[PDB]
Every structure is written in structure tokens, then in C-alpha cells.
């Protein structure tokens, strides 16, 4: 029987500093006296882990959380209120879900189509003691997996990592003593693998299961309970293994410039000097496409709006060439009753080129319109107007009862006999005008092409560009080059384009590469200080924050995107060092007469 415990609204979140926690043994491989670099899903250092108070002191708030790419879970309790977890997607009888419950003697893991309660919990009764899982779910069917082992679970701090990769649900755990409250401890401790379950189910959401004592919802009581939840990310770590195969330390390579240097050098100690650790690249912000204006549109209207159309047995043809075929004009027209295309889609026509276009036209009955197609037979299809099975082109038609019909019968239109079209004829008997656009594509120069769409021109920014088919990436600026009237773009001595004429304005623009270069970290040495300065080589200081993607970095890395201390040198942009007007012996060389040293802070 399910009861309603979550009668209170959700409380606001609290956060704790992870410091250095959530690191686990990435595999079952023995490594000793070695620094190993691994890429895996880890809890980032010094991240904000959410601190939940499922039972506050009798406020019950024990929410369903997202699983994302794996979860770090921790708790500090002696009351044994936390017993287990539910993992799954829908978390109802529609899908398989994973139920992990620990108890006094064992741990029971089941995967079934569980129908869970709205706010599920483990029922504990005292008589001896009794436990009931019927307060977690009302029923379970189609069980696919079952596993039973020993229990998974100052004060004791329990840490777990939950991953679900390639159908395997991996659990890591560690149990340590702690004498702190309302926080997570400082220091390093790696989590050893606990179990690997070959389950093969999808997990997107999970919920912590608590035990409540029977001493209806108002009859369930338990003491205060709280836990921490973090999330794993694709991170590179440098792990330090000691002589016994135990991980004793670790570096989060994306935490800061110093950690990045350590991971590059594969060492937890860095000597005084300057090291290149990475590179920056400026990315394009817009895509710019420019073409010449439209000079000549194809004379299709001359066919569709013809005063008179030919008879079906003697259909007329117009040749279309040396023009721009804006087919969207006819396709989006409300003046047509039908528009069908074979071998080509009517919505792609504006992007195509043909060697010839032909427009065939005639007058037929409504019940004859269906005959104007590939694979057709009939009086018209066979004797008057035949299209091939592999025909490429579009058949367009419309009613002409207000034009081609006459009182007494219009016998001017004939077929292989006269029609005798009348204004009072039924739909299938009324006259219809048909135009067929045949598209010829031979091994020859194109004569008909659709219109080219152009965008606005952007200057002084890193963009992608396309100038009349000439493509590339770079920065477009006004040029002082003098092109001859027939020259469209220029090249340097290396045969690379460095200037283009804008096809609409005829303005000459210079093309420069989007800023790029190395990133070097300047350090006094970790035996002296953990202060660093970062040099951005061959870049302007104004551009730095956008070259390193500051918004995608940690707060610690974002301090070095800019700041009060920004010094422009010939070597690049130096950030974090204070420039002085004194002169000393060179300590750490930067270039072009500039050196840096630690004097305490880093100076240039």
C-alpha cells in the first residue's frame, strides 16, 4: 500500500565543495610507482555537489533526480536510514527498472517492470523486526535480472559512484571515518570497484530509498536524513599510484593552468620555467555568402499566361536558356490546381542547373490531366502527349473554364476530334491548361540555373565565407589593393588567396587567418609557489577571452582569460604577470628582450 509522504513543497538547494573526492579506480589493472593519465567520467575537482535533506527536523522531501552520465553519491549517518536506490527511466510498469535495496544481512538487486509508489520507501516494523518492499512498489512483473550479495552500506562517510555503460551498471564504493559535519572532508581517497551488473537497461533518472518506522502517511516516522549528489563529466586525470598499487593522489587536468602543465609534463612537481601546454584557435561567428545580383529571370510566365494554348495533338514548345530559373515563383503560385515533379523535387529546383529547359503546353479535359505523366496510357498519353518513364521535369496544370469554354461548344480545340468545351460542363469535362517543364542535363555547359541567395557582408570578424564559389575561413577587412576590372580575387607568392572582390559592391577585401597560437604557462616552480602566468603567443590581448573559450572553462581557468594584469608583448599577450620598469638578470625567458620572475608575485 502506497501512502502520501511528500505533502510539503520542495525546499531550496544547498551546495558543498567537492574538494578532491569521487575519484575511483578506472580499471582492474595493477600499476605501481607510476603516474598514469586516463580519460574517463570523473567528478570535477572543487565542484558544487548538491546537499539534500530528505528528512528535515517532520518534513519529507526526497525528489527524483536525473542520472545524466553517472552519479556521485555520499552520506554521513549512523541511523541507517538510507537503504538503497531506484534507477530507471519512466520508473513505472512500462519499462524495466533497477531496484537496489540493502538490509541487515544482505543486498538484493532486482531488475523488473516495477510499479513504484509516488514517493517510495522501505517499511520497517517492530513486533523481532519486519521489512516490507511493498511500500516501494505495488507490484513487479517480467523480471530480467536478480543478484544477491553482502550489504553495500565520529561518524562513517559512505561514498558511491554509479555508472551505466554498454549495458553494464558499475558501482564503486569507499567507507571512511569522519569527524566533520555539514560538509565533505578534505584529502584524497580512491573508490574501489564493488560490483559490475550485466543488466542491459537504460537509466536516466534515480531516487534514494529511505527506511521509515511504523511508530496513514502520518504513521511513518524517521530521524533526519541527508545526502550529497554530484555528476560525472568526461575529464582527463593524472593518477598517482604508489608502490602497492594504490592511488594516493590525482590531478584534474582542466582545473587550472598549473594542473594542465602537470598533466602535460606527467608530474606532480613542476620546475621553474615556461611550458607550452595547449593551443588556442579563434572560431568563426557567422557564415557569409555573397553572389552577384540577378540579371535575367527565365521567361516562364510567357507560357503560363499565354493568350491561347495549343491543342493536345499539336502541343507547343518553348526553349528556355541563358537565364535564372526562379522556380519557387511557380511552385508557390495559387493559380495552379496541380504541381507534380518526376526525377526531381519542386522544392530543390532553385538550387539546380540544367543544359536546357523546355516548356510544353496544351489544352485538355480535366479527366485527361491524370494522363500527363510517366507510365501512363490513354487517348492523350498514347496518341497526343507522351512522357518517358525516366522523365525529369514538372507537370503543372490549371482550370481554364473562364477562357477556353464557349457557349454552344468550343470546337477550336481538338485531339487524336473536337472537344466542344462549354462553361456549363462538369469538372472532368471542363478545359484545363497544361504546361510541362522538361529538364535536360547533358555533358555540356549549363544554360539555366536557379537564383543564388546572398547574405549580408561582415567585416573585422572571424567568419566563414563564400564569394561566388570561392570559399574559406578568415577575417575580412577593407583592402588598399588595386585590382584590374577583370580580376576577382588575388593570391600571394605561396598561391594562397589573400584578397577577394565583393561580387555586389566590387569592393576589395583582405583575408587574414583567424587568430591562433600556442598557450604557455609560466611558473616559479611548485616548490616555491602555485602562482602562474599565462602567455598567449602571437595574439592580441583584446581577443584572448574568445580564443580560449573562457565560458567553457572552470572559474580558476577563467581568471587567466583577462584581469588587471594584462601586458602586451612581441611574443604574445601575457596575463597574470605585473610589468615593471626595472631590469634584472633574465630568469624565465619570454622573448624579444622580455623575461619573467617571481619577486610575492610574478613580474615581467
Amino acid at each position, epitope marked *: 500500500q502506497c501512502v502520501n509522504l511528500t505533502t510539503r*513543497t*520542495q*525546499l*531550496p*538547494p544547498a551546495y558543498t565543495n567537492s574538494f578532491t573526492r569521487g575519484v575511483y579506480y578506472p580499471d582492474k589493472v595493477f600499476r605501481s610507482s607510476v603516474l598514469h593519465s586516463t580519460q574517463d567520467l570523473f567528478l570535477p575537482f572543487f565542484s*558544487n555537489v*548538491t546537499w539534500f535533506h530528505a528528512i528535515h527536523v517532520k518534513r519529507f522531501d526526497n*525528489p*527524483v*533526480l*536525473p*542520472f*545524466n*552520465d553517472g552519479v556521485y553519491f555520499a552520506s554521513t549517518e549512523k541511523s541507517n536510514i538510507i537503504r538503497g536506490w531506484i534507477f530507471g*527511466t*519512466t*520508473l*513505472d510498469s*512500462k519499462t524495466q527498472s533497477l531496484l537496489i535495496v540493502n538490509n541487515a544481512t544482505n543486498v538484493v538487486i532486482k531488475v523488473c517492470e516495477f510499479q513504484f509508489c*509516488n514517493d517510495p520507501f522501505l517499511g520497517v516494523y517492530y513486533h523481532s523486526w519486519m521489512e516490507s518492499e511493498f511500500r516501494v512498489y505495488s507490484s513487479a512483473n517480467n523480471c530480467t535480472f536478480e543478484y544477491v550479495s553482502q550489504p553495500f552500506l565520529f561518524k562513517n562517510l559512505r561514498e558511491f559512484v554509479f555508472k551505466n555503460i554498454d549495458g553494464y551498471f558499475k558501482i564503486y564504493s569507499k567507507h571512511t571515518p569522519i569527524n566533520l559535519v555539514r560538509d565533505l572532508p578534505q584529502g584524497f581517497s580512491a573508490l574501489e570497484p564493488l560490483v559490475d551488473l550485466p543488466i542491459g537497461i*537504460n537509466i*536516466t*533518472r534515480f531516487q534514494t530509498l529511505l527506511a521509515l518506522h511504523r511508530s496513514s502517511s502520518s504513521g511513518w516516522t524517521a530521524g533526519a536524513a541527508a545526502y550529497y*549528489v554530484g*555528476y560525472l*563529466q*568526461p575529464r582527463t586525470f593524472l593518477l598517482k599510484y604508489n608502490e602497492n598499487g594504490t592511488i594516493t593522489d590525482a590531478v584534474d587536468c582542466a582545473l587550472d593552468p598549473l594542473s594542465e602543465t602537470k598533466c602535460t609534463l606527467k608530474s606532480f612537481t613542476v620546475e621553474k620555467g615556461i611550458y607550452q601546454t595547449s593551443n588556442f584557435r579563434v572560431q568563426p*561567428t*557567422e*557564415s557569409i555568402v555573397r553572389f552577384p545580383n540577378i540579371t535575367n529571370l527565365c521567361p516562364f510566365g510567357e507560357v503560363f499566361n499565354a493568350t491561347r494554348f495549343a491543342s493536345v495533338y499539336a502541343w507547343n514548345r518553348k526553349r528556355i536558356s541563358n537565364c535564372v530559373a526562379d522556380y519557387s515563383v511557380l511552385y508557390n503560385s495559387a493559380s495552379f490546381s496541380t504541381f507534380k515533379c518526376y526525377g526531381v523535387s519542386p522544392t530543390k529546383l532553385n538550387d539546380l542547373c540544367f543544359t536546357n529547359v523546355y516548356a510544353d503546353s496544351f489544352v485538355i479535359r480535366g479527366d485527361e490531366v491524370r494522363q500527363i505523366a510517366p507510365g501512363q496510357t490513354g487517348k492523350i498519353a498514347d496518341y497526343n502527349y507522351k512522357l518517358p518513364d525516366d522523365f525529369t521535369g514538372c507537370v503543372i496544370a490549371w482550370n481554364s473554364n473562364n477562357l477556353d469554354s464557349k457557349v454552344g461548344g468550343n470546337y477550336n480545340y481538338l485531339y487524336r476530334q473536337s472537344y466542344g468545351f462549354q462553361p456549363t460542363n462538369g469538372v472532368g469535362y471542363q478545359p484545363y491548361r497544361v504546361v510541362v517543364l522538361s529538364f535536360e542535363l547533358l555533358h555540356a555547359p549549363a544554360t539555366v540555373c536557379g537564383p543564388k541567395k546572398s*547574405t*549580408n557582408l561582415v567585416k573585422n570578424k572571424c567568419v566563414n565565407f563564400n564569394f561566388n564559389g570561392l570559399t574559406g575561413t578568415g577575417v575580412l577587412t577593407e583592402s588598399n589593393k588595386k585590382f584590374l576590372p577583370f580580376q576577382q580575387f588575388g593570391r600571394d607568392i605561396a598561391d594562397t588567396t589573400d584578397a577577394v572582390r565583393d561580387p555586389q559592391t566590387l569592393e576589395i577585401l583582405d583575408i587574414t587567418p583567424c587568430s591562433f597560437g600556442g598557450v604557455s604557462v609560466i611558473t616559479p616552480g611548485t616548490n616555491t609557489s602555485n602562482q602562474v602566468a599565462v602567455l598567449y603567443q602571437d595574439v592580441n590581448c583584446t581577443e584572448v577571452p574568445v580564443a580560449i573559450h573562457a*565560458d*567553457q572553462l572552470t*572559474p580558476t581557468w577563467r581568471v587567466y582569460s583577462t584581469g588587471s594584469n594584462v601586458f602586451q608583448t612581441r611574443a604574445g599577450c601575457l596575463i597574470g604577470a605585473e610589468h615593471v620598469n626595472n631590469s634584472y638578470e633574465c630568469d624565465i625567458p619570454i622573448g624579444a628582450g622580455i623575461c619573467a620572475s617571481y619577486q610575492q608575485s610574478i613580474i615581467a
Partner: antibody
Amino acid sequence: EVQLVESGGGVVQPGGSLRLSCAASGFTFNSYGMHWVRQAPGKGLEWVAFIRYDGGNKYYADSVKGRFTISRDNSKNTLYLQMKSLRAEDTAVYYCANLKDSRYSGSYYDYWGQGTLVTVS
Amino acid sequence: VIWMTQSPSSLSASVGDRVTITCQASQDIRFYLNWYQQKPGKAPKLLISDASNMETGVPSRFSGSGSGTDFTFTISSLQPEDIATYYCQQYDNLPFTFGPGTKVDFK
């Protein structure tokens, strides 16, 4: 407790650009994926974009692909939508939202902002 | 891309009447369909998730069911406060899509 506040709307010209932002509070923003949804005057709801909790994988509607970019700053609890080369057809009220999704975002709760109007003309 | 449609596009009903809205998918969205209720000037509110799972706070008069391509939303006893445009959303795969929306008016 939970709030989502859009801003950065206004009136721009065709071929121009506009960046929207949404301030999140009252929940663990950095644990959830986020969506943008737009609703033109007289029209229904159109899904625009989705970004995962870690700010990594990005998804867009076919109607905006190649023009719109979605991003987030998890240190400021702010969601962004960068739209460039906006056309008249892009006039709509733009919402930031946390849409309940048992398959992708893993959200168990459904939250919406107020909506900010963007006009292109 | 999965296309979504709704029928009728608009219906009128009085208080106490039973109101049903049909939503269809061009593909199999399994049970992955959200039902939203939107009133003028406000953001959409979720009433049902995963085809038939009611959201907390949603009146018992609201219900829904379906699987695959054919889903139904029902109000067992329409109230004056239930006048809104209802939308279906599929979330089987990205991009996510909404149906045209069905407007429920007052008889």
C-alpha cells in the same frame, strides 16, 4: 521557489542578430538539460534547441539549424540562445524551459519561464 | 523527424461534458508523449507525462492513454477553468516536436 527569467528581446532588422539569455534560480541548474521553445503570434509551440547539463552536446530544430547556437554558463546559472541572420519568420515569443523528459534530460519536473518577444522587421 | 497531428483542431463543450482530444504520430513514439495545457498570456503547463502518468496537482478529472501512434487525452467532466489550448509533445528522439494544438472553447 523555481524561477526562469528571459531577457534580451526587442526589435531587430532582417539579416541581423540577437542574443537571448535566461536566468535560473531555485533549483540545481547545472544538473538539468535545458530547452528553448518559441511561439509566434497566432501559432502553436515550436521546439528550437536543447543543451545537455554539462553544456556539451547541442541539438537544434531543422528550422534554425546553422543559424542558432545554444550555450550555458553553469557558474552564473544562465542559459543563452545566440541567433544570427534572423528573418521575419523568426518573430516569436522565446521561452527557456526545463521540459520533463524520461529519455534525454532526465527531468522529473516541468518548468517554464515567462517568455521574451523577439521581432524581426 | 517525427510529425505530430491533432484532431479536432477545435471543439466546443459545456460544463460537465466529456472532452476528448486525439493526437497522432507519424512514427512510433512508444509511450513518450507529454500533454500540455496553455492559456492566453501564459507558458504551457504539463498535465500528463509518458502517455498516461498524471502530474502532481492535476485534478482527477484529467486522464489519458495510448501507445505507438495513437494517443487520447480526456476530461471526464469539463470545468469553466479547463478552457485552454492543449498540445501533445513527442520526445522519443530529437528534434522534439509539438502538435498543432487543440483549442477547447465554451459551448
